[PDB]
């Protein structure tokens, strides 16, 4: 089932865009919130636009954008944290410890600015209903 991917942060639902872009809106109305989680490998996963078949994937400079292909920047590593909230680190840049992350007017916070402890790197995962 697909779901709705919250931010504490701002209270911001994880949104892509037909345009590749990615921000967060506090609608829990807006079709392209809802997204598809699938698992790769173990502990791995794509984040798809059930909408428009857009992935989550993140450049080189920790920008989150679609992307109209699967590919190794639309991997990421879901850790299910003790609070009961999630977390989503790239896997391209792990090392480099970059999380899925939203400001809290809703903006992306790039993954280099990111950090543990974050409360802008704490998603909960919802029903679309």
Known sequence: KPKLLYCSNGGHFLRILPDGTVDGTR???????????????????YIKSTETGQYLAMDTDGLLYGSQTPNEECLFLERLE???????????????????GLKKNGSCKRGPRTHYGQKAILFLPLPVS
């Open 27 to 45: 609608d829990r109305s807006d079709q392209h919130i809802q997204l598809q989680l699938s698992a790769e490998s173990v502990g791995e996963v």
């Open 82 to 100: 003790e609070n009961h909230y999630n977390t989503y680190i790239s896997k391209k840049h792990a090392e480099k410890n970059w999380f899925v």
